[PDB]
Amino acid sequence: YQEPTDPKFPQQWYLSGVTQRDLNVKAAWAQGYTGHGIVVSILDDGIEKNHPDLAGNYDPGASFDVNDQDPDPQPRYTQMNDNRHGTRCAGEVAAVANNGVCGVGVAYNARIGGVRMLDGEVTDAVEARSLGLNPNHIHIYSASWGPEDDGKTVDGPARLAEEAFFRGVSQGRGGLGSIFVWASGNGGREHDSCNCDGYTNSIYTLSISSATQFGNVPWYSEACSSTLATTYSSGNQNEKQIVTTDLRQKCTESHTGTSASAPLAAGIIALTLEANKNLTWRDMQHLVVQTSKPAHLNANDWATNGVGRKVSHSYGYGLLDAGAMVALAQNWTTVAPQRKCIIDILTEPKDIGKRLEVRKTVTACLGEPNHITRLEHAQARLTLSYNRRGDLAIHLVSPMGTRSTLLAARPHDYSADGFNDWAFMTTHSWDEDPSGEWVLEIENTSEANNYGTLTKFTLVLYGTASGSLVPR
């Protein structure tokens, strides 16, 4: 294998590195996987389809302009170069290789498109028509956007967009399911908590956080239990950033944030899908859980779950490992059909006060077709009132002892509107047996005399009843 000769490839430290602080992409390339035959679409502010490092891979069938209702996603050019983001993201996935221009995409032989959908009024219908674009042609969708990262918002997909997620994973890609890759958020400065973002908190999105070059939690990071894994992105000014295609046929070395991490993940997922085109949307999440690497990512909350895997709320299961992903994909056995076990926990409303603990021992639908012995995602769907929402911290403990933070204190969230059947999601108990005692903790983290009531707690378990590995 001959590595790319592109002029900025040496600057793509998160690929070209030789000091083990990288995404192990060369190993996949050397196995013969560069993205041939895979189609990825960037859902953002447009794509410069004539960019010298994108044109060779550009796919009009992966593209649309939902803002102006036409097929051509070319960005709107302005003095401030506002609409540059989709072009930056596209090059991370699929910039052309060995052409003397800028660097390379992770999947530099994949086909790449863009949906111009952020440059206008972004309605539920706009989101739904973007997520649902050409779903039997596009394999993988990448979205580096979501609800305002102000640390006070709780919001997620409305009805059309949620319907688009369920149609995508159910009937998309020939019934194997659209793969929706999501950036977990850029609200770290505001102490945002990313389970309050219903796009990344969805089970249907493969949510990705960031690590800095030196292996630390970047300033912009949001911790939450819904995140699955991590890719490198930007950090402090001594740390390098992401190198990619830029608006006006240029090359940038300064792409940043979790917005840059999701496209890198989408590229790795494209290499993985080339290695096994029959992988389902759930198969792909299993591969990420099994192969991602904690090593040398620094966080104070690394914990070993019930099947021996290390998990962090900043990083999920750790750094994506492209070589390991493509290797495991090749002989992967399709997982069994997804089961869903619904457990209504409360028999009466519960005053929260300073602190509330709810314990329930469950059988996880024993004796039923939805019996689960091998968890995937779990949700605590909570309905509660509280006078100051951001003073709450919420934890969920699995029978195996895995403590998932469902919500951390958000100092800027003054809302009195509580949570209305909000489906807080955790990936941290993946592959555990969910039978036994679950514990919900709700705590007032302030000294104020706050008050409210928990009126509904639905524990929703997803998973199967077959095929477990020996614990790590």
Ligand X SMILES: *[C@@H]1O[C@H](CO)[C@@H](O)[C@H](O)[C@H]1NC(C)=O
Pick out the residues of the known binding site: 6, 45, 53, 65, 70, 72, 82-83, 96, 99, 101, 103, 127, 144-149, 155, 183-186, 192, 197, 199, 222, 259
List the single partner that 6 binds among ligand X, Na ion, Ca ion, none, CB under 5 to 8 Å by kind: Ca ion
List the single partner that 155 binds among Na ion, Ca ion, ligand X, none, CB under 5 to 8 Å by kind: Na ion
Query: Is 85 annotated in the active site?
Result: yes
Binding residue for Ca ion (CB under 5 A) from 55, 60, 70, 467? 70
For residues 258 and 209, the answer to whether their CB atoms sit within 8 Å is yes
Q: How far apart are CA 83 and CA 443, in angstroms?
A: 42
Residue 59 found at the interface with Ca ion (CB under 5 A): no
Residue 278 found at the interface with ligand X (CB under 6 A): yes
Residue 455 found at the interface with ligand X (CB under 6 A): no
Distances (CA, A) of 194 to 131, 191, 407, 462, 469: 20, 10, 8, 21, 30
Name residues contacting Na ion, limited to 377-416 (CB under 5 A).
399
Residue 338 found at the interface with ligand X (CB under 6 A): no
List the single partner that 402 binds among Ca ion, Na ion, ligand X, none, CB under 5 to 8 Å by kind: none
Q: How far apart are CA 418 and CA 398, in angstroms?
A: 24
Q: Which of 234, 259, 292, 312 is catalytic?
A: 259
Which range in 48-56, 199-207, 279-287, 353-361 contacts Na ion by CB under 5 A? 199-207
List the single partner that 158 binds among Ca ion, ligand X, Na ion, none, CB under 5 to 8 Å by kind: Na ion
Q: Which of 22, 41, 85, 391 is catalytic?
A: 85
Residue 126 found at the interface with Ca ion (CB under 5 A): no
Residues sharing a CB contact under 8 Å with residue 24, sequence separation 6 or more, in sequence order: 321, 322, 323, 324
Q: Which of 44, 59, 431, 433 is catalytic?
A: 44
- How many residues appear in the chain? 472
Residue 334 found at the interface with ligand X (CB under 6 A): yes
Shortest approach of Na ion to residue 254 CB, angstroms? 27
Binding residue for Na ion (CB under 5 A) from 12, 83, 130, 207? 207
**φ, ψ at 94 (rounded to 5°):** -145, 30
Q: How many CB atoms lie within 10 A of CB 357?
A: 12
Shortest approach of Na ion to residue 377 CB, angstroms? 8
For residues 340 and 460, the answer to whether their CB atoms sit within 8 Å is yes
Burial 119-140 (b: 16+ CB within 10 A, else e): beeeeeebbbbbbbbbbeebbb
Q: Which is nearer to Na ion, 202 or 244 (CB)?
A: 202
Joined together, the tokens standing for residue 13 give 């430290």
In sequence order, the β-bridge partners of residue 271 are none
Residue 155 found at the interface with Na ion (CB under 5 A): yes
Query: Is 344 annotated in the active site?
Result: no
Q: Which candidate, 197, 193, 260, places its Cα nearest to that of 230? A: 260
- Catalytic residue annotation: 44, 85, 259
